[PDB]
Amino acid sequence: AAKDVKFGNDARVKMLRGVNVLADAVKVTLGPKGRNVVLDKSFGAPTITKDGVSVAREIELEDKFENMGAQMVKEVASKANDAAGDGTTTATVLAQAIITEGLKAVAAGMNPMDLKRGIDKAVTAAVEELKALSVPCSDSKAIAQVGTISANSDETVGKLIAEAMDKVGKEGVITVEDGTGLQDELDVVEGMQFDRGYLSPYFINKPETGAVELESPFILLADKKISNIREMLPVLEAVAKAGKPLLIIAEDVEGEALATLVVNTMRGIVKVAAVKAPGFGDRRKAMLQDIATLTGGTVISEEIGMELEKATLEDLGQAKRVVINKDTTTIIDGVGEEAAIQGRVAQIRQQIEEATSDYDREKLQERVAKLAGGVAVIKVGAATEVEMKEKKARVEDALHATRAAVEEGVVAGGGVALIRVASKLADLRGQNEDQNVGIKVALRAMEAPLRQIVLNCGEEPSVVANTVKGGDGNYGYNAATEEYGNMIDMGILDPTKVTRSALQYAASVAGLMITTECMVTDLP
Amino acid sequence: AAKDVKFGNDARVKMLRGVNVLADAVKVTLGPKGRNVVLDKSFGAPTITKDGVSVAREIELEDKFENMGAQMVKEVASKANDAAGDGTTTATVLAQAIITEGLKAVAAGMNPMDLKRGIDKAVTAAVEELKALSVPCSDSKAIAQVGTISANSDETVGKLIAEAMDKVGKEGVITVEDGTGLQDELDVVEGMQFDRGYLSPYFINKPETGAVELESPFILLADKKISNIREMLPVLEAVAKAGKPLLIIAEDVEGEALATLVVNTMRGIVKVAAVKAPGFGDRRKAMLQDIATLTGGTVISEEIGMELEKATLEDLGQAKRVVINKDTTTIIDGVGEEAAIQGRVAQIRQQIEEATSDYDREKLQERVAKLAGGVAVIKVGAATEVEMKEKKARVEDALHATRAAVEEGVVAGGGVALIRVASKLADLRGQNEDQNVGIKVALRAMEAPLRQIVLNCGEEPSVVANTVKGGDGNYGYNAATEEYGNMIDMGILDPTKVTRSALQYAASVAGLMITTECMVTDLPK
Amino acid sequence: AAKDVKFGNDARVKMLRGVNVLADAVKVTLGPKGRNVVLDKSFGAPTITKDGVSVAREIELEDKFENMGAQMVKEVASKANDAAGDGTTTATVLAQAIITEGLKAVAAGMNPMDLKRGIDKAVTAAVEELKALSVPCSDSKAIAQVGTISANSDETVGKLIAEAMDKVGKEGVITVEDGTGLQDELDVVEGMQFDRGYLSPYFINKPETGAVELESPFILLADKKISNIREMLPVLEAVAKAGKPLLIIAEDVEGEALATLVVNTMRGIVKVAAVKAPGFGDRRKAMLQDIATLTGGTVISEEIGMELEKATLEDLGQAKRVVINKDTTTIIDGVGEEAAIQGRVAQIRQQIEEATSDYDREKLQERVAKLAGGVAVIKVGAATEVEMKEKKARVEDALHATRAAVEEGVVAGGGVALIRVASKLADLRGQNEDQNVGIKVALRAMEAPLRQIVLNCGEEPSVVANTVKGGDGNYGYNAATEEYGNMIDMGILDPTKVTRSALQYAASVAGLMITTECMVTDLPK
Ligand SMILES: [Mg+2]
Known part of the structure; x- marks a missing residue:
């Protein structure tokens, strides 16, 4: 024009x-x-x-x-x-x-x-x-103080964050969820977090945080670029039964596939969210398997000759919750068996010994830190649902502030x-x-x-x-x-x-x- | 833009x-x-x-x-x-x-x-x-006076409200309905009220009060978030057959489910209304059972592995009427058996004795107050339908005024x-x-x-x-x-x-x- | 906006x-x-x-x-x-x-x-x-005079009105219809009148009088609020085929139901008119049965478990004519059998003796006065169709005037x-x-x-x-x-x-x- x-x-x-x-x-x-x-x-x-x-x-x-x-x-x-x-x-x-x-x-x-x-x-x-x-912010006393200030002078929040970082570490993964009652809760579950956001802002279901939350969802792991919806029908139908959401982690989701998923999800026929697989090249293939082991699913790799049409619900992994924002995806409480996970952690540790490159060792150390590290879950408690949602927000915001304080003071x-x-x-x-x-x-x-x-x-x-x-x-x-x-x-x-x-x-x-x-x- | x-x-x-x-x-x-x-x-x-x-x-x-x-x-x-x-x-x-x-x-x-x-x-x-x-408003005389003034100097209304609060108490649940004749009537039936409103203003069938009224409806109690309509087809069809309305009390109703219910109800294929379950967390689960015992229905908990597809009419509870506004839901005259209700009331007060903290006791005392308290029903009578509706309005207005007077004077x-x-x-x-x-x-x-x-x-x-x-x-x-x-x-x-x-x-x-x-x-532009 | x-x-x-x-x-x-x-x-x-x-x-x-x-x-x-x-x-x-x-x-x-x-x-x-x-207006001479003056100095009309009021009384129901020939006629048939008008001014088919006239119509008696047209489908698709109109007497007709009937009737697919049931509460239920017995129809009460979908032509009552204005509805010549009506009249008379209240007796005496009283039908005659319609109008107008004169002079x-x-x-x-x-x-x-x-x-x-x-x-x-x-x-x-x-x-x-x-x-804008 x-x-x-x-x-x-x-x-x-x-x-x-x-x-x-x-x-x-x-x-x-x-x-x-x-x-x-x-x-x-x-x-x-x-x-x-x-x-x-x-x-x-x-x-x-x-x-x-x-x-x-x-x-x-x-x-x-x-x-x-x-x-x-x-x-x-x-x-x-x-x-x-x-x-x-x-x-x-x-x-x-x-x-x-x-x-x-x-x-x-x-x-x-x-x-x-x-x-x-x-001014540094290292000791837990300081972390609690920064958390309190960021929480509008609420000592409770400061304490929660301090305890959470004491469990998973300062570089550890911490999530915040709704409380089941009045008392606050802190647990460490099997989980992982990777630097990949939603592939469309139309997957967002929680506009307040501007993120995507999926409750008890299935996770599809495909080492392929999905461009057509034809190959997804058999899997989408299986997910439409049992009425549970679907997280698609593939090399990429584009074209018709993305569009169909964007529309169908906004219509409310099937709740679906898609993100790219973490990293690239050989590392990507390896991390897809980490997610598979963790979620107790199987990776559908076309390299060995697997097709998406022959993907059953058994091939899909699952977790208790999934949080996706613009930049990050967090898988919380994977169904993966303890034996399987600890098994792959030991496997990767073996690869750290065989590592010839320093770069190769650092990348492996990162993957074990994720699998073994787990995820901290903070359940915010209150006397009313309104007070609970309000406090939850302050905790999430204070968490980001405290994290940033621990990094550069x-x-x-x-x-x-x-x-x-x-x-x-x-x-x-x-x-x-x-x-x-x-x-x-x-x-x-x-x-x-x-x-x-x-x-x-x-x-x-x-x-x-x-x-x-x-x-x-x-x-x-x-x-x-x-x-x-x-x-x-x-x-x-x-x-x-x-x-x-x-x-x-x-x-x-x-x-x-x-x-x-x-x-x-x-x-x- | x-x-x-x-x-x-x-x-x-x-x-x-x-x-x-x-x-x-x-x-x-x-x-x-x-x-x-x-x-x-x-x-x-x-x-x-x-x-x-x-x-x-x-x-x-x-x-x-x-x-x-x-x-x-x-x-x-x-x-x-x-x-x-x-x-x-x-x-x-x-x-x-x-x-x-x-x-x-x-x-x-x-x-x-x-x-x-x-x-x-x-x-x-x-x-x-x-x-x-x-100036405080405690004695029944005062309550009657405030009710009279709020009713445009009608001593009748003042008396009705006073009598109603004397039966269920000052914090008791009082409801107002159309009269069957000239005589006013007051009865206390098995019922409950919780702070949850309609999930869509398109359920409103009584635009005058801006509320939802369901006559002799079935009540579905599900401890799950309903997002798809697939899972209630079996229940909706069973309710379509007894030609009776349906109240859905679930953790939440959203997405397609809500939309379909909004449309289907406005088309008049099946009269349905949905509200959230009261409270949250563990307390929510407990109160869903209170409603179940009261309405004589069974809770469909997915936690124990129950599905909504296998839900029969027998699993649904029922009452004489349900009134739902933007904030509150009131269940009037449940079919729950007296033995079942009195049984759970005794169960909860047993829990009051084992309660360690004060907060736990106050919350349990609240649930027993609802189950045992019941609901007062005021049928406003008159000589003409016009006068009946008119007086009903004054009673409803004077009721809210009197309640506010009892709270702060x-x-x-x-x-x-x-x-x-x-x-x-x-x-x-x-x-x-x-x-x-x-x-x-x-x-x-x-x-x-x-x-x-x-x-x-x-x-x-x-x-x-x-x-x-x-x-x-x-x-x-x-x-x-x-x-x-x-x-x-x-x-x-x-x-x-x-x-x-x-x-x-x-x-x-x-x-x-x-x-x-x-x-x-x-x-x- | x-x-x-x-x-x-x-x-x-x-x-x-x-x-x-x-x-x-x-x-x-x-x-x-x-x-x-x-x-x-x-x-x-x-x-x-x-x-x-x-x-x-x-x-x-x-x-x-x-x-x-x-x-x-x-x-x-x-x-x-x-x-x-x-x-x-x-x-x-x-x-x-x-x-x-x-x-x-x-x-x-x-x-x-x-x-x-x-x-x-x-x-x-x-x-x-x-x-x-x-100045009072009691004696027949005066009634005839007022009727004559209201009829533009036509002694004939004055006489007709006087004779009619002499048969059914001053508070009796009098109707006017087209003549079959030159000679005027006056007959008393089985009928009733209640204070309920059209629910929509779009039912009006006679704009001159501003009323609704239905010839040989079917009458639906339902003690329920009709809000959807879905439940009317089976009954409606049985009236148009019959080639007759339909009068709906229900607790109320609102929402889609009313709208659909308003449109369909103006399109001329099925001639339909709706009015509320007389009275309210228990009395309403009783009077709906009076109409049923009189029209030879059956009431579809949902209280006993009747549905409107299972309503057949046999369930509908029928009369020779129905006149509906903004305030009143008049049923003329019901098909109800003499034995059935006389039977219910005697039944109500028995209730008058068991009546404890004065109010109760007066309301029952009103019920019997309608059923037993009947309706006077005036067929206006003339030499030409034009003169017949013209005179009919003057008779209807003079009737209203004369009635008002009898009330307050x-x-x-x-x-x-x-x-x-x-x-x-x-x-x-x-x-x-x-x-x-x-x-x-x-x-x-x-x-x-x-x-x-x-x-x-x-x-x-x-x-x-x-x-x-x-x-x-x-x-x-x-x-x-x-x-x-x-x-x-x-x-x-x-x-x-x-x-x-x-x-x-x-x-x-x-x-x-x-x-x-x-x-x-x-x-x-
Ligand atoms: Mg006139």
Whole structure:
């Protein structure tokens, strides 16, 4: 179709205007004195929320160019939330700040490519300063504290997470499920987790978490690319009987097969979800068998001459529950016999001895860690179903935060960490004046979050920001109590991973937009 | 789709304008000299009403932003009516008053978050003053009085409610049905009520009450999530043959199953209604058995390996009637044998003795109270079908009012209780000046109801309000007779729960709107 | 959908404008020198009429608010014609007069609620004065006279009505049918009448009378609520084949069932009409059996386990004709055997002796009076089919008038009675000045009919009205001859019931509109 093309300043202003609508809408929720955004549903009453992620999802602009701007930031900003479980709003506010001053510079005559390099240099330096500022989170006491803070000052949640990580380890797999009663429960069952998400967002049945949950499902393991639904009929019919869901783990599911599964599942004829098999090549084949042993199913490999038509319900494995999000799949409580699993673990351990390559050994060590490690299951208990679902949510969110804290520690929150690191990089310079401007653009942008928080509180941002720079370390401003002091001590903190990711992603898109000269889109 | 986004004052003014249309439309009905609102019907002659709930339901604005404003207040204002069975109009009037003055403050430069905190502080204080002002409602004489006042001065209704609560108790289950003749009747039968509503508003067969009524139905008790319709075909066909309705009480009914039941029931092939099982976890399993013992049915537990395909009519329980609304389900007159029920009641109290914690005992005591407590059935009688339906409505309304009165008591009506509480909170302060303004915004807003009532009567609100503040206690202005005195004595009162709910919900939305900076909605296209 | 909301004066003026279009269109036909209204029918040549009811039915306005006004008056005004068989036009003219002056007062600053109270007080007083002015109508001579006057001075009709009422009594059921020839006939057959009308105005096949007539129809008796058409399939596919209509007498017919019957009947696939069963509760069940015994049908009671699917033609009762209007249903000449009916009559008479209550006896005595009383059938004869249909209409019209005359007597016509009563209530006062105005508004409005009649004649209304007030009793102005005198003697009169109903209904709607502050309707979109 005919396209509308824009260039230079004309394009960049449109791009900016779009980013402002997005940022301006989300940054009102930032801070403890965050404001409400009203999202219309036109079926029932409007939604009132302080969740910047919810707001972002709704933002789409009529102007095609302005929209492109908002959609570029949204995409990248969401990755920050996918990595650390927080920081999408922060990333958006940072992006705005960098782009605004960035474009001002470009208009002044600065070279866009140099500006970008200057920004990136300021960020790499800022990340290194974050590491130095970071406070470790290792002992269980600390883990419980971070969990409590992330759970809205609930000591219970902090304890649960601490106990869970003490059972499966810090790199261990932890899941959260509904409680059967009032008392909380913690068990370690046979399970595994691999880095593969849903092949279609239409499999999502739990929109709140944005994940797919399957209760007592069958698991199909095929070492083949499924493109047609013809070969699935015999298996789908067998699953349609006994009325249980189906998880398809194949090399890939595409074309008709995917489409049919997407439709049939949304119609509610047969609940089905599909994900790619973990890894690639030889490793993929081996891990499919791990899942088979674990779920007590058989892998349908066409390599040995097996066909999907002759796949019976006995060939399918099964587990108690399966959770699938955009990136990960978790199999919980496989029916696989203890003898079979311990048998394959010992088999792989034998392969570790025969390993010639270091790489080969590391990959095997990873697979045994999964099979032997198992999965921790936290059943959240409460007195009411409403209280139970609510607490469950806080546990899941606090879990992600605590995990991130264990990886890279914690730094002062309330946007202090960013303004702190920026203050330490005053003498940072680049190869030319344009790069120097890029650095200053980034350093000034790192004040955006704090300033915004202070603004929402109704205080003078410039004064607070000025005072915070005066201090050192994790000294900052507690926007909630209006008192200055050690942010970590006052309980206002963020996982260093969050702040890091937010900044890096923010700078990523900001850098791309600053170096854009042409935009192509459809006509109105 | 592309969205229209507004910010700051631009958004808040739009939001306000929408709230004014809603409020200005409903507040004309407030008071004993309230005016009529004419609601147009797509087909037929228009409706003339003084019911602010009926008016509110119809309010929808063309402007997307203004509409969002009206819909936010409607939603929250409705919850006051769901809690106490009255106060939707009051909550709307309050909301308007708080938002109006609240936004004026925001524009003046006040911090919205402080304004909200100041309002909330004034409300929490106002609620405490309401409790103090409240007059308890315990003795049957009082219950009859409140029931009479709520029934438009009909002593008959007051007596009926009093007698009913004297049989099943104050926390007992009371239901109302159509009369068979002129004589009113009251009977207590084997029954139970649990906090679970319909799973689809398309099961509603009685749109008037907005509930589902099933006559002599079968009850299916399955401890499983039904998602497919394949597994009930055998049961549905067996129920299609006895030509009787079916109540499905399962862990949950969703997907195709729900859809098919929604369609088939609206087509009239088989009358069916579905609700979730009460509670969750282990307690859910136990209560499903309580229903089973009561209805004389058997629970189809997949845990022990039972299937729904092998479910016969003998496995289904049955009662005389089932009433299901958005929140509650009531089973009336179960076929369960007296020996079976009394047997399980004794079993549970055995469990009360073996109970280690207090929580476990309280929860078991709750289940025995349901099984043994039974259900009171009030058949409203009259000389004409029209008069019978009319009186039935007054009994149902007066019942909800009386219940609310037994919970938190009664306070002066006519909007006096609010203006009274407000006058006692003149010295209330907050942490800063902004919060202090928030407090004054709330205190001035609590005069809105009275002022509006007086206005509808054609008298000077500022004079009446000024006189009422001069007095103490439940001293106020009877808008009907235009005389001052004790409102309780004059018979102008409201359940303390009503006034409280109305205020708290009104302040809830008002606080949210005052602290709104952004609104997102679709384009006029 | 988005709504358009108006308030206060803006709403009331819209309402008024709509009432004016209605009133101004119908009031041109009022009086003996009434004018013609030309109604377009879109299929053929236009209709020319002086029937204000026909005109009103056609009135629908483009402006949604104006329309609401006209539709409110139409609704209430029609009830006057349903009660006394006349007075819709009068009620409309009165309504206009009250609303016009009423709103003028509201705009002046008068309190709407007081204005309404003042009006109502003036009306109750006016009705009492009407009773005093009323002249009884008891003896057959008087009945014949009133019938003659109502039949446009046809002594024949007067005699027919007199003879008919002499057979079945004054409170007896009288029906009118087409004649077989020139000679008129009068017979008493097995029949009954109960106070239940059509469930949908789309069943009407005789738009002239606004009723439903079914010839040699089958009658379905079910003591259940029919909501689905599925259960009707077997019975319906047995009526169309028979080539006969179907009358459904059930507890109620609603939802799909009603809709399907409304459509199918208008398509002409199967002629069907539905009405509710008489009474409620236990009494309803008993009366449904009375109809069964009378029509020679069997009741399908689900209580004993009968289903509507297993209903055969043998289960259905049948009569020679059925007449259904908005309020009443009349079964004429049932096929029920004399032995069966006389058997149940004696059975009920036995229950009268065992009756403990007075109320119970009175209700049973009503049941027997219907079954034993029967129905009088008047076959109107003439020399031509045209003359026959024409006379039949006058007989039906004169019948309704005469019945109303027997109930409350007759008063001066030509709008004299109203202006007479008004002149006697000059000293009537209220509690305050606002109510006093309301009274004067009503008294001045009672001159509207006369003045309009005089206007249509081309005379000065103010002069005539002034002269009529000068006299006393039933002294008035015969607009036809332009002579003053005793209106009753000159043969210009109206059943007291008509004038009463017209005034009361007129004041009812007027009172509601005067107390309206808000109107809600859809947008022009
Ligand atoms: Mg007539």
